[PDB]
Amino acid sequence: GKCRGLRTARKLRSHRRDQKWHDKQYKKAHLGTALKANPFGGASHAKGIVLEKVGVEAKQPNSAIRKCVRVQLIKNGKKITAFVPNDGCLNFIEENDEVLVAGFGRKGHAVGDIPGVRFKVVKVANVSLLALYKGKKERPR
Template identity: 40%
Template structure:
């Protein structure tokens, strides 16, 4: 690997010194005529990469100076935000199937969920909050954004008291 790096850097130095364009034949001719012995196979490999749309010289990168790094500033990557409902606060959906999901490790109670086909065409799993429900296939529910932490892949919740999902029943004391 070290030999490869040395040979690529010597080829790049040679091409920059002779002011050569990245043409395959001229690059090969100049490198075979020079004092860099044993680099012809590497040059052939680099020039054969022209078929992929890159010239051999584009594979070699220059180092950036501290001043250039200072001018450019720190590299800040943009994070993609998860938008399960494409930026909408609520979406209507049709229940395809009722599910019982098991939560992640420390928790153990089964969670009641439904597979919903939303009005934007996506099929997602939605959590049903509260105790008890009467949802079946073809029922219509309103879904809002809100992930359930201990259920992997569940990013939306059903809204109680809208369409076919009634309010939770108030439990009386003992």
């Protein structure tokens, strides 16, 4: 059982401090290895240069070729695989051009079918993918 004494505040506080490190979320947030290992470096978005276009096979229950791009982040130079969400949107991206990439929605975790992909392309050539998909804007020549 736990200590119930008027002068056990030190023991209770120290035990909570120690046992908080056994929480995955707390340790990830407060240890610093996750921020060092995070390609964005704690940022919500990041810019990169599209190194190439790749096709990732969906995980076994599903069958599809998810169109991603290998990009290299400008801020630090890391190589990232970023999903290109909608259909035909891979036709908007051209190799060796600027691209704004966000997280995939699960805070550094792969989403759905696409394995090992935790980033998605948000903008290409400083115009959003949603504007290109709907025809609101066009690629700058």
